[PDB]
Symmetry: C2
């Protein structure tokens, strides 16, 4: 058997004292080999006397290897204690990574295989696992950490305490992350990790739902998001050391099944998947100081460093390249990057881009500053990859970016982008009070109605968009010259590449018999295809390919018609799948998420502007009285702190007033008023001059008038921020128009 | 034919006006399609009337496609102007990347294919290329750039000028790097790019040497490094628009052949290849401020960003993991990283390391600061990749790191690491004057007579190292217990993994007939293999496998002997291959490269320490007279500059005195004394206090005594810096010993 070490007492008289360790891969086998052979260090721990390893890598074949090394019978049932007394090992233990691929997939399939064939051995305690510490906390001076076996235990432990400055918190998501002394202290308490799976009462139908195919019970289970284990379930598990099958299938395997969907289907607020959101949030960061051109592989190295992107580089590089492409009929109609180089053309679907070693990239920086404003990205909920900030759960943009640009998936997801000039009409009919169709506020928001039209894109397209009852179709154009009988194709329909279209005519033997040769002299943007066809063919291709009222006789000869049908499946902001059915209700489910963020922005910058005015009044008082205070006389730093305390200057923290990054308004009012004297002490000996003082005095006057306007804005009808969300509609409209007149180069 | 567009007049009456554009790949075909179809913009340029494209991707098959689309005859010779008048295109043009893969390999094989079969068509001008601008220079205000077709032309143009601050310099190494307006201005001057290959008189034997196999003429051509084209050759080429075959084969193809060997063979100064040197120079940079752990994919993203690493990530990630492995018998005996995680064991060759998503890494920082000191890395020759500063040409370490750690290559290169305690003896016999064997200074280097042993490693090894005449062999150990007749293998010989050794015994059918079962219970470090063998076998395996004086009867039964033979092929610092033949002459070729860097370090920091003392005397005079000068009275910044000029303060540049990064000593003395007043002006209002003044006054006293010692050091026998190179030997010895007592964790 491949990768199987047997115990020295398997099969014999104590062949019910021997257990089988089923590792996931090949590093885990070296961890188990490290731990079984301690010898002199563990007089009581496990060894190769009663434990034998095996692999599971490749899921069959290794399952037949498990059947061969245990002695399992496919025809028995193992109900009595003498049928299962002649197995070769006592139990099976799974030494699997505690991540989504480990606990969600390998252990789930191992449980489903032991459930479909021998559902008595789960009951009598034959299938086990060993559970490893997920999170540890080290404090200085002490050697012993504080080991947590779930994330909610650490979350409960962290709220009780105050100072978390001298603690370092390590996460261990996979079994290769455990260092040498950590493994040597794990396998001295080996029996306190092995937990036993009990076949729960409701586990039967859950095994059938998950590991049984795509059906309606599964498709209505996955529409609600993962619910974590509570405190009582956790305490019961750690008391009796028994795990129900239902709790494992309801936490780990469901998180794995929703892990995949979140990679293929976009969130409906911004219209982006998880990888594209890492790419956008990294591209705002690296092109913030200087908007120079980085190569695609250098920007890929940045995004895989700072945004925690771990799926290799080829998916990353092709997503960066797909973020920059601006040919007619491409995915992004409003790209977030500018393509300095050659990124691909419409003729073979955008897959003829250059090597990423040769092509540069840089931000839009005029579109992207008016669509995703930087004074809202401090207020969005973030994801935390091993206790580090990575990216938002979702961006909230100024216009609904999920119905505005094309997108498809080879879960069914297909979006056909909607016209700009009539989503702007209904957003500005929602907001503007004096707009004479503000009765979209109630008729169309309480229940779903229709007041303003919303039709497909029709941009970079010279065909025709025609509606037949309930569908739209996209047509092409052609021109015929009967003097030499050649058909020239001038426009393909939407999203159809040209090399695939030519080979689509090549592989049709039924209509290759009417043409002689076909060649394309098209250029990078337009279409010019010459169809050299045989003589006496113009009159018979009209009398075989029938004139339908939809598709006329030359169109169905040349395949010049496409169907616009759309699958509107998205992802909830909390988790789970929405099956929308109209393009209206996506934006009606987007509008309540925007105005709340306007109100929260206005209140937070109201508070920060208060204490900015305070600290700069204090520093302009210092730079007037500094000629007579003469702090160079004094001996040290705390003496100058005392003397500045005697003259009535407030102590303040200078790092938190100038840059409140992610602190909430309660944190801004609790611990931002006590501090020290460094806003005065670390001056520049250039702010003491008279022109600097003049600049700072007019700056304090600007902030006071701004405070007056913010307090005016927070009591505006219809809601706080209506007169700051129309001007951002105008700014993003002006940047879109300035980008459509430059071929998205922004000169 | 796959990917072939034909011209509208090929084959016909003007079938000698038509040319064939042979692109390298698939982005180049879209560039050529962009440029041929300008139409109304080029009334005179090329189009699809007299030009037709084809691909070359896959080098056969595409060469047969070229033969099919041109009409070439394998049996003709094309000597007369009527044999070659019935070809279907007039000439062939190659639209190839101007990089090492493009010009060095694709165009070289195209020339060799047209030379081996039709060596008359190169003469009569059938094989061409089109040459693109490599480097452009844009200056603000002007639209027209200054296009250069070689790197030496830009190097000549850059020396004439003074201000290169308002110029931006773009490099175009591959044909996908050309923006849309740049392509539209390239193909308005299309005829001024097409150059013609002339079959040179000496090109015959050079084609045979390069594209003819591995022989002695090639192996003695590649030992000298690439010589660039001069000014006269360049001017002749750009005058007559004709390229000899010999100049292309001597620049481009030789640079390609030496580019692949620099990826596999190490430089002999540091013992590192090009990719490992990018990894070391990136690892010194990211763990400089805070040496906290950072995962292997995040550090890979850093190294692919800042050190210009473009070979994908899988080679990068496996080189980072190979840089951190510290099992017995591994490649690096002195690793530059610390492996926080599970990085592999000796049993399957170090290829069982965990996923890079789960494992952390961090520097040595105590070994690496005493081996590659940071006050020498400003002085080394660096490589420049697209004008950016990437990594040095070679590090120069404190001990010869090429003969100190193991290394091999599947060019023949195999190094067996040498004993530490007797390379330290001969380095300290070279340096120390009072060492009673300082007669190694002339009698062993200049006269080549050995006086100091230097034997193999013998560390992490419990076998025996025995010498038989001219080779060393490495043996293993075993123990036999004849009561049950089981052989226990306790130590394999050097560098032999255990899974491969077990399968080596498994696949030998001639000696599997003496054993019954074989299984291993080894620990991650030690070896414990049980050989269950058949009865009546102990007396016949000694009478078939003969007792040789080298390999005894059980050793050649169990394959417990290895051969230590070494191929000492390296790379010159300037370019080319050295074939060394002894381990002595590598370090004797290393010692003249170290003491020159000591002398250069002492002189540069002598100069910088001079002007540091000057600027801090000036700033301590200011912070005494600042209570009475009272510059807060003054109105602006240039007024304070004038008033500080009136009181006799020197103007200085503060960014270049505190951090002379890569400036030479001549640049330190030319433009580091004129400047402005910002070293006074941007003070802190914390340096004015009395304790800060005390710190700065004793700092100036320390720098004055240091200047006295540097002027003492520069006139020391045997050479400048002998009393600063013995203490660094002691520091690196102490760090190596502190790392061998911690299993390279540095607690």
């Amino acid at each position: 058997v491949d990768k199987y070490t047997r115990a020295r007492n398997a099969g014999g008289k104590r062949a019910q004292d021997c257990m089988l360790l089923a590792a996931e891969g090949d590093s885990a086998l070296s961890l188990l080999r490290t731990g079984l052979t301690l010898g002199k260090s563990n007089p009581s721990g496990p060894s190769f006397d009663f434990c034998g390893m095996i692999s599971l890598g490749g899921v069959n074949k290794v399952l037949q290897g498990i059947v061969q090394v245990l002695g399992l019978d496919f025809n028995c049932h193992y109900k009595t204690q003498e049928e299962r007394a002649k197995l070769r090992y006592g139990c099976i233990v799974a030494c699997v990574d505690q991540d989504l691929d480990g606990c969600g997939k390998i252990l789930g399939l191992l449980l489903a295989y032991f459930h479909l064939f021998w559902p008595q051995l789960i009951i009598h305690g034959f299938v086990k696992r060993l559970l490893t510490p997920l999170i540890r906390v080290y404090e200085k001076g002490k050697t012993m950490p504080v080991e947590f076996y779930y994330e909610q235990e650490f979350d409960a432990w962290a709220k009780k305490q105050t100072s978390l400055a001298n603690h370092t918190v390590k996460y261990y998501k996979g079994l290769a992350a455990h260092d040498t002394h950590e493994v040597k202290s794990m396998f001295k308490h080996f029996d306190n990790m092995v937990y036993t799976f009990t076949l729960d009462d409701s586990a039967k139908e859950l095994f059938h739902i998950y590991f049984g195919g795509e059906s309606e019970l599964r498709k209505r289970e996955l529409c609600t998001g993962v619910v974590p284990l509570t405190e009582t379930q956790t305490q019961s598990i750690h008391s009796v050391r028994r795990i129900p099958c239902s709790l494992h299938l309801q936490v780990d395997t469901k998180a794995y099944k929703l892990d995949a969907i979140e990679r293929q289907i976009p969130n409906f607020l911004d219209g982006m998947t998880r990888a594209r959101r890492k790419i956008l949030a990294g591209g705002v960061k690296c092109f913030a100081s200087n908007n120079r051109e980085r190569k695609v592989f250098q920007f890929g190295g940045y995004v895989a460093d700072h945004m925690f992107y771990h799926h290799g580089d080829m998916s990353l590089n092709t997503s960066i390249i797909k973020a920059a492409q601006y040919y007619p009929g491409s995915s992004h109609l409003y790209p977030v990057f500018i393509g300095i180089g050659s990124f691909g053309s419409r003729h073979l679907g955008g897959k003829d881009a250059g090597s990423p070693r040769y092509i540069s990239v840089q931000l839009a920086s005029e579109f992207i500053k008016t669509m995703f404003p930087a004074e809202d990205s401090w207020l969005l909920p973030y994801v935390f990859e091993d206790g580090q900030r990575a990216e938002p759960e979702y961006y909230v943009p100024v216009l609904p970016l999920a119905i505005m640009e094309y997108g498809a998936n080879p879960w069914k997801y297909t979006t056909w982008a909607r016209q700009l000039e009539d989503i702007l009409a209904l957003v500005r009919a929602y907001v503007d009070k004096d707009n004479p169709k503000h009765e979209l506020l109630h008729y169309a928001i309480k229940h779903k109605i229709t007041i303003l039209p919303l039709r497909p894109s029709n941009y970079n397209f010279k065909g025709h968009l025609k509606r037949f009852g309930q569908y739209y179709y996209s047509y092409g154009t052609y021109v015929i010259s009967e003097q030499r009988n050649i058909i020239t194709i001038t426009e393909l329909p939407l999203r159809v590449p040209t090399v695939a279209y030519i080979e689509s005519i090549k592989k049709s033997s039924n209509r290759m018999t009417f043409i002689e040769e076909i060649i394309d002299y098209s250029s990078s943007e337009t279409i010019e295809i010459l169809v050299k066809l045989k003589p006496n063919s113009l009159n018979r291709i009209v009398e075989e390919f029938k004139e339908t009222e939809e598709q006329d006789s030359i169109e169905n000869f040349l395949r010049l018609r496409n169907c616009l049908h759309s699958h509107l499946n998205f992802v909830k902001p909390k988790g789970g799948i929405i099956e929308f059915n109209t393009y209206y209700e996506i934006l009606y489910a987007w509008l309540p998420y925007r105005r709340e963020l306007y109100q929260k922005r206005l209140m937070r910058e109201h508070a920060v502007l208060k204490l900015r005015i305070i600290m700069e009044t204090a520093i302009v008082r210092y730079i007037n009285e500094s000629a007579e205070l003469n702090l160079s006389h004094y001996e040290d730093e705390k003496e100058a702190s005392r003397i500045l305390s005697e003259h009535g200057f407030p102590p303040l923290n200078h790092t938190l007033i100038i840059s409140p990054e992610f602190a909430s308004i309660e944190e801004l009012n609790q611990k931002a008023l006590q501090g020290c004297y460094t806003y005065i002490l670390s001056l520049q000996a250039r702010e003491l001059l008279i022109a600097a003082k003049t600049r700072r005095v007019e700056k304090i006057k600007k902030m006071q008038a701004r405070l007056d306007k913010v307090e005016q804005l927070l009591q505006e009808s219809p809601f706080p921020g209506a007169s700051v969300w129309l001007e951002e509609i105008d700014a993003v409209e002006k940047a879109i128009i300035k980008g459509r007149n430059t071929q998205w180069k922004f000169h």
